[PDB]
Ligand binder design. Structure first.
Ligand SMILES: Nc1nc2c(ncn2[C@@H]2O[C@H](COP(=O)(O)OP(=O)(O)OP(=O)(O)O)[C@@H](O)[C@H]2O)c(=O)[nH]1
Ligand SMILES: [Mg+2]
Lengths: 1072, 170
RNA sequence: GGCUUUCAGUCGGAUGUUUGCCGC
RNA sequence: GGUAAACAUCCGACUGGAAGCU
């Protein structure tokens, strides 16, 4: 009625050819496609056609399409088939394996696939119960030869994948084949093992025996299949089978690591095996790999990592072997720590020797990889005490020194590593990113190494220093010297800080210490980048001066000279970055020095005082930033007077010029009036590029702000009570009996507070569009974000400008832009720090809260996101958190109330803009995310500890309370998935848990639950939110539905709810 | 014209395989998702520092009911790109499928994995959750056919791999 | 239902390390 | 020195994958 077998085969050949034709009419294509679909659905003689096309004579393309048919029939048409038809199709396909395919070495990989897919498809249709002799049938086919055995391996691996890993079958049918698999798993895995074992053997003697290449090549190909298909089971199957015959499977897999043709397969089996997670006791037998026998083949294969140039085949094996060795160490670390029967392997020395082989190899990738396992080895409760590990650290750190040197670019040719870096990373950018992030992790691991062998680490950091000191825009840049110096510094500094934690007060190489300290001191450079390492090496070595205070002056000399300039050139050329970097770096070391050893710097105080006084004498000489770092340092030494009045007098004298300029009559006007202010700073004016007087003004104002902040941040009573008493710092003691301190800088700072709040208020007012429009067109984005700060928070990276260059010149607009951002943050910083510094002399200030509200919180409606975030973090968070409860009433309450109300309102409106939906807008979306997190965090830290005192306390307030609940439950509706869980689990609940008994205004109850639901509505998709929100929804319907009845009102508006199933649950809780 | 290589493009329906290619060839962005039927082979020429290099790109339809020969298009391929969408979590789940199918039919070919449409508001598939490429030792590049972010990176890497010249420039 | 260890996710907290930026 | 962002080690908050227990 339809067609004859002969006729269809003909068109099917014409259709497969047109489809494979790269250059065929698109129209002929569709008709070919439409032919085949129809054929595969309706044609009753498909199997005769499939078997015909599928036959060895045709072109591979055609054979494959024949086989694809026989697969499509098993897969879509089995149910519309007679028992006889099936038995016929089965026997034909089984015949196909028997001898309907080409022999082994001829025969495309794809045909083996297509034939294989058909068997697997029939196995999944009916393996356990209608096809019981399948395992025997395959076992029979496999004895016929290698072409067959390979085919069986293709099938057992596809079958293992589809049912277990991809599990692509209905749940029910899937489950039964897996149970069957497991039941037969000893048989199946025994079969995989012996196949492998014999095939390898035959390949063994026959390999190098000239007149037998075809059989060596064949027995090999089966090995590869076995290893491949084994790799399908090795991770999922019970550990019984792996361990099976005195662990023969794992033994051979090690032996095969030294056979070039089977290694990658065997490495891949080892890898999966040893990454097997789960029950700790199931991994215990993995320790066999540490055995004498296995370790031998492991080490042998690892020794061949001679690294003699990049051979793609070998290097790819090494990347694999390496991961095997990594996982096997993490296994060891995980099994030992748990004391559970696992005792340190005898052969541990061999594992290490072998691991070290990869640690010292040229390849960046290979070295980086070892790090994590080394980090696990070095923090082991037990293995860091192992002496085989102790023994290995000299060789390890020796490796790390080289690892520290930033050599091996994909583009350059300087070192062996360069070759491989090309294999592994597209560009230098991909290389950098890997390198730098690698070295972060490398950092922590190297410390643990030093912590375990402090003597050696110091000795080798020592010798690398002595070495660097005497070796090697045409002065210095990114030359081999600088790169060598930076790595050397970094190692040493790392080594010394570590040493002064582990070695007792007495094991210190003092003599060798000062030895090096001297050499560093006497060394000399006119080159900024080198000096900058010098300065670091001084600070690293500086704990030595504790023993030999004679050296202090030299130390001061070294640092202060660097502060002043870099004699690249003075008032004639522009300041290069590396120059302004060392100066900053020196000033930094000055603070670190004074902050860390101050009894030490103490005897030398007048001299430093005098020095800094001299340096500031010419107001034009140092940077404001430099000026203040020095003042900061001076403050830090005065902490050591440990005496109130003594410090009181110093600081008032230190601050005496700053007070002058700040409390000045015309400064007051500048600080209070917006027009006075715009004036002082030069946004009023259009020489369209001679800002000149404007700059100096806005630098003096920065100077005061920088100072006030400096003093507040650093001033300190003695940290020892008994001592704090004696210098007259203790004012009395708390109810709980904790001393109450007064701080020497209180009187002085408090005097500057009115002008600060003055400036703060004014600065905030400038953000009004009618104030902002008062700026001149040159400077209209004076108060916008620096393009620096933009690509910053969009993740859009930057190029690295050379430190020997000043190409980016400080634009008049960019100059102001930097000023505003810093002045804004710095003012708030002082207020942030005022609380924890002054204590209850700041908190008890009269009408503080009102002053703060009218200044700091004055113009929020116009204050942007990027300003408010800084404000909250730097100012509000600390103001509140450091407040003694006595005044949660006085000021915390009157401030947080209006703040939370506002913030919440601001955010909801911000979120509705976002819910409404190039770079310029997309950017602002990011700032809403970060602000929201900041706000939620602020709320959490405030009352979550269940609530803190000021949690309880703020709740016992009308406005505060409402604002905390609204905000918290509204958070669930914002599209930021990070806040959902945080707020839900930590915040939403204990808030309601506080306002159970009493007034739960009916309208409030209904809203609360609707808002939790909007949460489930917004998120949904995300497993984190949903679970967490469901539970929270459940807690509200359970503490609130025994009392109120309007909760159910809400439930019934939810799409698809059986009211009957509701009723049943509703009454279940209203009875017992 | 010179060497010429066979390139196989696989992945779920709607991950933008056809649009990625239509771009490279013409240089225009296609908006409507007209479902691909089977395959559409496209030649792409790349004047390198080593001469012109051609790419026969087999744009195979990854819609269940529309792939023609499917596995048959992989026949004698020499490099492949497996593509998925970051809007659809499902498409990254299905990557190991597209992979098993490829290596089985033609083993040892360089494959590049590609997460498309990174220009879309919020990525459901987070850049940190992408680990498959590391377990199967393949290259990855998140990309966009509307944005052109890493537009040529997959071709360049393949080209680099086939010719065995790490310094190869497009 | 009452009490716990192991294994992946989504966070949370605490240290630690690294990389950017800081002439106003 | 300060500030922001990445990663790593450790001890909870819940979703889900094996069991011990009153
Ligand atoms: N925003 C965005 N949309 C894209 C991008 N790439 C593709 N699309 C859209 O995705 C949809 C489908 O793209 P196609 O290329 O047709 O999908 P395909 O891989 O050919 O689908 P199949 O061939 O059937 O597997 C279209 O609606 C395109 O507009 C992208 O990079 N960004
Ligand atoms: Mg397509």
């Amino acid at each position: 009625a339809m067609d004859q077998v002969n006729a269809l085969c003909e068109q099917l050949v014409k259709a497969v050819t047109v489809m494979m034709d790269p250059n065929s009419t698109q129209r002929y294509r569709l008709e070919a496609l439409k032919f085949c679909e129809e054929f595969k659905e309706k044609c009753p003689i498909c199997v005769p056609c499939g078997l015909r096309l599928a036959e060895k004579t045709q072109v591979a393309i055609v054979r494959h399409f024949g086989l694809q048919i026989l697969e499509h029939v098993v897969k879509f048409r089995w149910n519309g088939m007679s028992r006889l038809e099936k038995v016929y199709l089965k026997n034909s396909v089984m015949e196909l394996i028997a001898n309907g395919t080409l022999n082994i070495l001829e025969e495309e990989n794809h045909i083996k696939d297509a034939l294989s897919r058909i068997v697997v498809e029939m196995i999944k249709r009916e393996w356990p119960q209608h096809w019981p002799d399948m395992l025997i049938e395959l076992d029979t086919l496999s004895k016929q030869g290698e072409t067959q055995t390979e085919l069986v391996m293709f099938i057992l691996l596809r079958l293992a994948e589809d049912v277990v890993t991809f599990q692509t079958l209905p749940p029910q049918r899937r489950r039964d084949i897996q149970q069957t698999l497991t039941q037969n798993m000893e048989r199946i895995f025994s079969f995989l093992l012996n196949t492998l074992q014999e095939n390898v053997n035959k390949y063994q003697q026959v390999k190098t025996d000239t007149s037998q290449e075809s059989k060596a090549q064949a027995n090999c190909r089966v090995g590869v299949a076995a290893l491949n298909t084994l790799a399908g089971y090795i991770d999922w199957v019970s550990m019984s089978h792996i361990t099976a015959e005195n662990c023969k499977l794992l033994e051979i897999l090690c032996l095969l690591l030294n056979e070039q043709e089977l290694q990658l397969g065997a490495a891949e089996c080892l890898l999966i095996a040893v990454s097997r997670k789960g029950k700790l006791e199931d991994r215990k037998p993995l320790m066999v790999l540490f055995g004498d026998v296995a370790m031998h083949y492991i080490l042998s294969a690892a020794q061949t990592a001679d690294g003699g140039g990049l051979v793609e085949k070998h290097y790819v094996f090494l990347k694999r072997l390496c991961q095997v060795l990594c996982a096997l160490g993490n296994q060891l670390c995980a099994l030992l720590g748990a004391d559970s029967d696992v005792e340190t392997p005898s052969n541990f020395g061999k594992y290490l020797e072998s691991f070290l082989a990869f640690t010292t190899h040229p390849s960046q990738f290979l070295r980086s990889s070892t790090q994590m396992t080394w980090g696990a080895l070095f923090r082991h409760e037990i293995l860091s005490r192992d002496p085989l590990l102790l023994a290995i650290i000299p060789k390890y750190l020796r490796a790390s020194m080289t690892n520290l040197v930033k050599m091996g670019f994909p583009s350059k040719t300087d070192s062996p590593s360069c070759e491989y870096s090309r294999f592994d990373f597209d560009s230098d950018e991909d290389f950098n990113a890997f390198f730098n992030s690698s070295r972060a992790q490398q950092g922590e691991v190297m410390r643990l190494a030093c912590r375990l062998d402090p003597k050696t680490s110091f000795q080798m950091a020592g010798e690398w220093l002595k070495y660097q000191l005497s070796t090697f825009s045409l002065c210095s840049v990114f030359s081999p010297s600088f790169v060598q110096w930076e790595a050397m510094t970094l190692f040493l500094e790392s080594v010394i800080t570590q040493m002064f934690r582990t070695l007792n007060r007495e094991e210190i190489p003092v003599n060798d210490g000062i030895e090096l300290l001297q050499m560093v001191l006497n060394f000399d450079t006119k080159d900024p980048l080198i000096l900058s390492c010098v300065l670091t090496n001084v600070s690293a070595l500086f704990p030595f001066v504790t023993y030999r205070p004679e050296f202090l002056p030299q130390v001061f000399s070294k640092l202060f000279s660097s502060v002043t300039f870099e004699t690249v050139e003075e008032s004639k050329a522009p300041r290069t970055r590396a120059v302004r970097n060392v100066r900053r770096h020196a000033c930094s070391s000055i603070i670190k020095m004074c902050r860390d050893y101050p009894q030490l710097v103490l005897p030398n105080f007048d001299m430093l005082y005098n020095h800094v006084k001299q340096l500031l004498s010419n107001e034009l000489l140092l940077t404001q930033m430099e000026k203040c770092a020095l003042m900061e340092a001076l403050v830090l030494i005065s902490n050591q007077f440990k005496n109130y009045e003594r410090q009181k007098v110093f600081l008032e004298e230190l601050m005496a010029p700053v007070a002058s300029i700040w409390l000045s009559q015309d400064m007051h006007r500048v600080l209070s009036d917006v027009d006075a202010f715009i004036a002082y700073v030069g946004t009023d004016q259009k020489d369209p590029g001679l800002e000149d007087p404007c700059g100096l003004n806005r630098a003096r104002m920065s100077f005061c702000v920088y100072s006030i902040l400096g003093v507040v941040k650093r001033t300190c009573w003695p940290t020892d009570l008994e001592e704090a008493k004696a210098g007259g710092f203790v004012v009395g003691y708390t109810s709980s009996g904790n001393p109450i301190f007064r701080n020497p800088c209180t009187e002085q700072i408090l005097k500057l507070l009115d002008n600060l709040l003055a400036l703060i208020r004014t600065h905030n007012t400038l953000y009004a569009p009618e104030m902002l429009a008062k700026m001149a067109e040159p400077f209209t984005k004076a108060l916008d974000m620096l393009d620096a700060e933009k690509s910053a928070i969009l993740g859009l990276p930057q190029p690295l400008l050379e430190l020997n260059d000043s190409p980016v010149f400080k634009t008049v607009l960019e100059r102001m832009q930097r000023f505003f951002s810093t002045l804004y943050e710095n003012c708030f910083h002082i207020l942030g720090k005022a609380g924890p510094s002054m204590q209850q002399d700041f908190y008890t200030v009269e009408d503080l809260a009102t002053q703060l509200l009218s200044s700091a919180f004055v113009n929020l409606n116009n204050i942007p996101d990027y300003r408010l975030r800084p404000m909250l973090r730097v100012f509000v968070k600390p103001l509140v958190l450091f407040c003694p409860p006595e005044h949660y009433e006085a000021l915390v309450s009157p401030i947080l109330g209006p703040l939370f109300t506002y913030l919440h309102m601001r955010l909801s409106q911000k979120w509705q803009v976002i819910n409404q939906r190039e770079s310029q807008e997309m950017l602002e979306e990011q700032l809403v995310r970060m602000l929201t997190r900041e706000v939620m965090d602020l709320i959490t830290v405030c009352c979550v500890s269940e609530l803190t005192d000021l949690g309880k306390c703020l709740m016992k307030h009308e406005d505060v309370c409402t604002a905390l609940l609204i905000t918290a439950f509204n958070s669930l509706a914002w599209k930021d998935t990070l806040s959902c869980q945080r707020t839900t689990s930590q915040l939403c609940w204990p808030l309601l848990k506080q306002v159970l008994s009493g007034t739960l205004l009916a309208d409030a109850v209904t809203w609360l639950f609707t808002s939790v639901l909007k949460g489930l509505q917004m998120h949904g998709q995300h497993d984190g939110c949903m679970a967490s929100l469901v539970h929270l929804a459940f807690q509200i319907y359970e503490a609130l539905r025994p009392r109120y009845l309007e909760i159910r009102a809400v439930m019934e508006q939810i799409p698809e709810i059986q009211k009957d199933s509701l009723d049943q649950f509703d009454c279940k809780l209203l009875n017992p | 014209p010179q060497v010429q290589f066979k390139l196989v493009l696989v992945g779920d329906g709607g991950t933008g395989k056809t649009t990625f290619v239509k771009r490279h060839l013409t240089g225009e962005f296609e908006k409507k998702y007209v479902a691909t039927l089977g395959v559409e082979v496209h030649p792409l020429v790349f004047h390198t520092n080593r001469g012109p290099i051609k790419f026969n790109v087999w744009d195979t339809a990854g819609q269940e009911k529309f792939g023609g020969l499917r596995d048959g298009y992989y026949i004698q391929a020499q490099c492949a790109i497996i593509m998925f969408d970051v809007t659809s979590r499902v498409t990254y789940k299905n990557v190991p499928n597209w992979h098993r199918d490829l290596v089985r039919v033609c083993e040892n070919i360089p494959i590049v994995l590609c997460g498309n449409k990174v220009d879309i508001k919020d990525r459901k598939v987070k850049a940190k959750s992408i680990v498959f490429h590391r377990k199967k030792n393949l290259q990855y590049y998140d990309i966009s056919a509307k944005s052109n972010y890493n537009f040529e990176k997959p071709f360049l890497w393949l080209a680099r791999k086939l010719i065995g010249d790490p310094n190869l420039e497009f």
